[PDB]
Each structure stands twice: as structure tokens, then as C-alpha cells.
Amino acid sequence: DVEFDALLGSYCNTLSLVRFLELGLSVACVCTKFPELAYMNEGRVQFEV
């Protein structure tokens, strides 16, 4: 008697990294990065109408 099994191939996934600039939902955004934020307390923005 001769009997055997075999592993015919093995398949993976490719998780494409999604840059947020590749999204054009950034056109609803003004993204600027702080070097640090958690040091900062309440900041604010002035407007003149």
C-alpha cells in the first residue's frame, strides 16, 4: 500500500495601506500635525466678522 497527502498551495492576504491623502475626504479637512498636543490645555480660534 502507498498512500499520501499533500499541501497544494497556501494563500495569503495583502492589506493595502490606505493613505488618508489617497482619500479625498481630506478635501473636507485641514490636517496639520502638532509635534505634541497632550501637553496643551484649551486652545482656541479667533474669528472677525
Binding site: 505634541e36 497632550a38 501637553y39 496643551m40 490645555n41
Partner: protein
């Protein structure tokens, strides 16, 4: 050093980590579905049966009138903040000026409406804890001190330190790192003064509830006691402070409970019948047969009027933690809590080790 964090998303019904900022005590609960029939099971006879759940019902009905936080959900409140429990029992402290000062920001700095309705009701629940005889130290249990808190509407995320130093946990703000213990001055009571024992050394922090059992108003007092005694040596010290409370809980508290018809009985003749050899005996095979048990002595004890140790209960304790320095550091400052100033004891370098509870009855 090694310290252990905890995370448990609990409601903000009776806790405000937005208010009680950093390094306050927290207390876990037993999810009160267990409560109502335990009072129906473990109460002394003759007392009121369902007073606990009816009083606890009036709390849960008055937790949220607006927006309809329902009376039952999957997520149930488990945590009670320490400054809430002090303000609950606030009518019974010795220093009335600081007592209302704790209650002042509780009614104001919390997030909600009609907070004073909760306070007079939760204390009424605590008055119903003792009479219906489910003791709060069976229900309350230590939970760690705050380091960070993620809040929203009603539910919030809580990060607490279960064991190790209160300091060494990172806050989450590198602008304001490591925190210290904040306690109201109404509860922090040393025994270095009231035993007169100075000198350097380490001290063992202790949580202490107080129970005044009576058919009238019953009380609660919570104390964080700094002492150099072990749990093997704390028992006379809690007796010497609260000795009159020990006497009244023996005398009162057993009403109504029916005595037997006096008197039962004249005392047992075991010492009298053992000396005389003429007294009738019986073998092992002769007993539990009726004829040999006819000539034997009949002895009916009655214990219905006995004030026993379950109803002689006064104050109880558990281990809280150490202060490993040569001399402990206790500062007395006042902070806002804008714009209410509260007398606050600040403790330094607390290392947490919980322990099992112990009744001093």
C-alpha cells in the same frame, strides 16, 4: 516599579471622574439584583422584610428622571465614588463645617439635575442596608484610584490602580504626570493623635464603616484611618473609640424580637448527675429507642430572645495600603473644584494592597 492597571467601563450615575479628578478612592458594588431576598433571608426575625428593595427602588427611580435611563439594562452601575459616599453619610460627622463643604460641590460640581434628591435617598438606602441586615461592607468592595478617565454621556471608561504604588502609573497627560491621593478631611482620622504615639515608622491605611443598629434612624460613617497597628492589633482600638456604639447595639437592635415565656429554664444538671453513680444512663444501642429515652432527662433550651453577635455588630474594617516612608506625609490643603473649596487631606506615596473584610462584633 511594578503596578497593575484596571479598566472597567462603568456608568457615571454615582461617580463623576470629570469632577473628582485624580487619585480618589473608588468602591465596587454587587449589582443589586442579589440584594432584595438576601434581606428577606438573612434578617433577624420580626423586622421589616422588603424595606431594602423598596428604598433601593426609590433610588433607581430617582437616578434619572430626564432622558429615561431605564431601571434595568445589560450594563448596570457597579462603582460608587468615594466623595459621593462621604456626602451620603455627611450628616453624621463631627465637623459640620467641612461636612457640608463636601456636600457643596457634590450638589454643584457633578453633572446632572437634582443631585440632592439622590443624596438623601442613597443615605436612606444605607439606612435601609443596616436594618434589613445586608451590611454595606458585604456589598461595598475596594476598587483602585483614578489615573485616567475617558468620559462621554452616561457611560465612561475608568482606568484605576489595583495594586502597587499610587504614584508610578502614567496619567496620560505628559503635561501633568503622576498623581497623588485626594481625600476629604471629614474621614481622614489618625490614631497617632488619639493614642498619643508619635515616632517615625510606616502606617497601615484602613477603611472603616460604622453601624449604629436601632429601630430608629441608623447611621453610617466612613473613615480612612492612618495607623501603625496591624489587623491583628486594630480590634481594641476600634473598640476604644466607638465603645458606646458597642453598648447600644447590644441592648437595642433586637426589637421587635419575641422572647419566650419566662423563665426557661432551671439550669442543666450535667455536673450534678455525673458525680452520683446512681443516675440512670443508656448505651449507644439503647438511645433513639423510646423506652430507654423515657427515663432520661429532658432539656429544652430557648434562644429566641438572644441578642446574638449578628445583631451585636458595630464597625468593620479591611486593609487598604501602606506608607513605606520613615515618616508619612499628610498635607492639609483646599482646592477647587471650581468654585467650591473643600478641606482636603493629601497623602503621599501610597502603595495599594487590598484585603478581606473583618467584622469587629
Amino acid at each position: 516599579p511594578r503596578h497593575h492597571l484596571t479598566r472597567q467601563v462603568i456608568l457615571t450615575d454615582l461617580c463623576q471622574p470629570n469632577a473628582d479628578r485624580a487619585g480618589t478612592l473608588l468602591l465596587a458594588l454587587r449589582h443589586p439584583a442579589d440584594l432584595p431576598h438576601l434581606a428577606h433571608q438573612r434578617a433577624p426575625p420580626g423586622r421589616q422584610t422588603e424595606r431594602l428593595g423598596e428604598a433601593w427602588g426609590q433610588l433607581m427611580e430617582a437616578t434619572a428622571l430626564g432622558s429615561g435611563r431605564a431601571e434595568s439594562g445589560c450594563t448596570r452601575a457597579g462603582l460608587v465614588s468615594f466623595n459621593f459616599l462621604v456626602a451620603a453619610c455627611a450628616a453624621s460627622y463631627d465637623a459640620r463645617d467641612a461636612a457640608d463643604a463636601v456636600r457643596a460641590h457634590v450638589t454643584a460640581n457633578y453633572r446632572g439635575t437634582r443631585v440632592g434628591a439622590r443624596l438623601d435617598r442613597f443615605s436612606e438606602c444605607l439606612r435601609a442596608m443596616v436594618h434589613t441586615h445586608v451590611f454595606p461592607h458585604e456589598v461595598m468592595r475596594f476598587f483602585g484610584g483614578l489615573v485616567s478617565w475617558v468620559t462621554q454621556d452616561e457611560l465612561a471608561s475608568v482606568t484605576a490602580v489595583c495594586a502597587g504604588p499610587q504614584e508610578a502609573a502614567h496619567t496620560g497627560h505628559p503635561g501633568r504626570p503622576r498623581s497623588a491621593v485626594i481625600l476629604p478631611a471629614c474621614a481622614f482620622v489618625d490614631l497617632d493623635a488619639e493614642l498619643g504615639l508619635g515616632g517615625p515608622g510606616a502606617a497601615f491605611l484602613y477603611l472603616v464603616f460604622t453601624y449604629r443598629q436601632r429601630r430608629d434612624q441608623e447611621l453610617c460613617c466612613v473613615y480612612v484611618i492612618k495607623s501603625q497597628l496591624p489587623p491583628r492589633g486594630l480590634e481594641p482600638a476600634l473598640e476604644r473609640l466607638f465603645g458606646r456604639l458597642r453598648i447600644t447595639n447590644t441592648i437595642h437592635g433586637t426589637e421587635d424580637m419575641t422572647p419566650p415565656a419566662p423563665n426557661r429554664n432551671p439550669d442543666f444538671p450535667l455536673a450534678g448527675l455525673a458525680a452520683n453513680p446512681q443516675t440512670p444512663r443508656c448505651s449507644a444501642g439503647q438511645v433513639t429507642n423510646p423506652q430507654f429515652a423515657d427515663r432520661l432527662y429532658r432539656w429544652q433550651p430557648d434562644l429566641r430572645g438572644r441578642p446574638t453577635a449578628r445583631t451585636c455588630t458595630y464597625a468593620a474594617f479591611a486593609e487598604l495600603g501602606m506608607m513605606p516612608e520613615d515618616s508619612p506625609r499628610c498635607l492639609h490643603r483646599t482646592e477647587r473644584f471650581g468654585a467650591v473649596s473643600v478641606p482636603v487631606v493629601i497623602l503621599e506615596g501610597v502603595v495599594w494592597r487590598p484585603g478581606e473584610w473583618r467584622a469587629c462584633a
